[PDB]
Design a protein around this ligand. Structure first.
Ligand code: GLU
Ligand code: GLU
Lengths: 70, 375, 183
């Protein structure tokens, strides 16, 4: 007697609609983009300072060959 | 109905002011009677509860014989029609929306660097230090014109992408010149893209006006005046957007129904756009011409109801009103007054007429502090 | 000294135009100004790029013609209504001063003071493309905007409160039975 007209069905429309929604309401305009973190571009500094130290390594190996001038 | 500069010193019908006050004399001249003006003891237009249906408001004052002829901006509806009598509508109107006017938001004097973080700029400065120091140590190993003033200046011209004066010639000097280029190539392009990110998000922002988007937006709350018709116009409805408003407003917490119109204005000003408000077309228009000038009308009018002169069932004086309402519409004495109080308020300055030039093209305040660093 | 007044415009120009200039300043007093001029342009060139993307990404529509006040100021547009009806007389009964400027300019209209076919004023505005306007019933404007040639737009709001009644002769045999059946 419930299923023939949907007292099971129509009440399941209501109680599943009743308690609020969390859907496409906050995917669209509940964001603003932020400033970049350092962590967005942190690895460039690792490439940078990693490039800094290896320059000093070749600076040391220059004088080894510069002293070879003999 | 207005107040008066002589609120206490003045006596009689002259104690107040307004459209209907002078319109009462327009009826009193034509119909030839004497009138005493009274104030509703409640402070509300009219309610009708799931109860003994006593009209808490001006209607029950007019139903129960305390008043004789009611003059008010009162909505002509069918529920009021069966219980009192109305004249012809003298003014056209509709439901309209009052919100906080979206004003010019405050920019920053250093708002140009906002798509980057101050942690990043702190690291850019510190990377600018050591690279010049490392190159100088690479440069001045005399067992060459890159001195300390040159190594700062070469690194400065490298980072700004404005060319260079000379180039390093030793291998280790070219290495640090290499990685500093690949450093700054990312950072400038990262700054440009995130600067485009703010401007594309800003234009994506839609100011809600159609009132269906307002029904779909839960952050902006919206309420109506209680004990009137707007509270009742959404009670009985047919449109699913109207029913969803009524489903929202019934299930609303806290109370979106405000007892008076002025506190309903007051909630909007404190909310900075969090709380919208629904009211009539004429009442929303008059607040616009006053001078906080922070209220505006969005969307189109909902329906076309009317204001009518109210008489109780069996009042003989309602038919001479039906003479004069027609006659003052023929001469335009309605329109003579309906014009008069509404172009009088030009005191807002018509700020909406001269501030519709908004566009995404920047103001100088967006890039002001760049000149400050320049000067 | 290489920075003449004819030279110094050129050095500042290529720095603004992203082009490396050959002649650099050789003083701590000079190099600060060309330095901060570089950092000046590095924002503005990027800011021109970022904003121009936003016009190309997000498009906006330009239509200042709404709410019947902007109709009253602009006199480049020609209004259109239907003769032998309400709008022929309702503007002939112009008492409001903004409606006085309508009906005077509606009488000062050429050649279409009115039209005679509702579907032709549809066709005329489609060919008008910014020269001619058409005022009409609200739900008539709404319905054609629901029909899809989709080159139609409703602006502003209702200029009047009107309604359609069943016309019965005065002293109708069935007028009040109709009126109760309306109820
Ligand atoms: N003019 C309206 C005010 C109340 C309302 O908007 O509901 C009336 O008297 O019904
Ligand atoms: N329904 C209207 C159509 C013509 C008009 O809008 O002027 C009438 O017969 O008056």
């Amino acid at each position: 007697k419930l299923s023939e007209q949907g007292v099971l069905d129509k009440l399941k429309n209501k109680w599943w609609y009743d308690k609020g929604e969390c859907g496409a309401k906050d995917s669209g305009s509940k964001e603003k983009t932020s400033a970049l973190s350092l962590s967005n571009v942190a690895g460039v500094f690792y490439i940078l300072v990693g490039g800094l130290g290896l320059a000093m390594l070749v600076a040391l190996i220059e004088f080894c060959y510069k002293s070879r001038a003999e | 109905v207005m107040m008066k500069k002589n609120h206490e010193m003045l006596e009689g019908n002259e104690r107040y002011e307004g459209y209907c006050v002078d319109l009462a004399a327009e009826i009193a001249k034509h119909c030839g009677f004497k009138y005493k003006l009274t104030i509703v003891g409640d402070g509300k237009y009219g309610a009708r509860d799931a109860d003994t249906k006593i009209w808490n408001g001006m209607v029950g004052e007019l139903v129960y014989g305390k008043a004789d002829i009611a003059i008010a901006p009162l909505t002509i509806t069918l529920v009021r029609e069966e219980v009192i009598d109305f004249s012809k509508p003298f003014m056209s109107l509709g439901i309209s929306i009052m919100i906080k006017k979206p004003q010019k938001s405050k920019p920053g004097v250093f708002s140009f660097l906002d798509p980057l973080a101050y942690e990043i700029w702190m690291c850019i400065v510190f990377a600018y230090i050591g690279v010049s120091v490392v190159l100088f140590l690479v440069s001045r190993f005399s067992p060459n014109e890159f001195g300390i003033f040159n190594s700062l200046w070469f690194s400065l011209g490298a980072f700004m992408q404005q060319g260079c004066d000379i180039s390093p010639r030793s291998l280790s000097g070219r290495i640090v010149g290499g990685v500093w280029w690949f450093f700054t190539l990312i950072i400038i392009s990262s700054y440009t893209a995130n600067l485009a990110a703010f401007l594309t998000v800003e234009r994506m922002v839609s100011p809600i006006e159609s009132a269906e988007d307002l029904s779909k937006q839960t952050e902006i709350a919206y309420g109506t005046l209680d004990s009137g018709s707007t509270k009742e116009f959404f009670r009985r409805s047919k449109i699913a957007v109207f029913d969803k408003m009524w489903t929202y407003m019934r299930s609303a917490e806290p109370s979106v129904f405000v007892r008076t119109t002025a506190e309903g204005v007051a909630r909007v000003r404190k909310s900075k756009g969090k709380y919208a408000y629904l009211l009539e077309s004429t009442m929303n228009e008059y607040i616009e011409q006053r001078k906080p000038c922070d209220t505006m009308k969005v969307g189109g009018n909902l329906d076309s109801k009317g204001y009518g002169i109210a008489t109780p069932k069996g009042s003989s004086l309602g038919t001479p009103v039906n003479l004069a309402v027609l006659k003052l519409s023929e001469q335009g004495v309605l329109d003579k007054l309906k014009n008069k109080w509404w172009y009088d308020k030009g005191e807002c300055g018509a700020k909406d007429s001269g501030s519709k030039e908004k566009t995404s093209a920047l103001s100088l305040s967006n890039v002001a502090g760049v000149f400050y660093i320049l000067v």
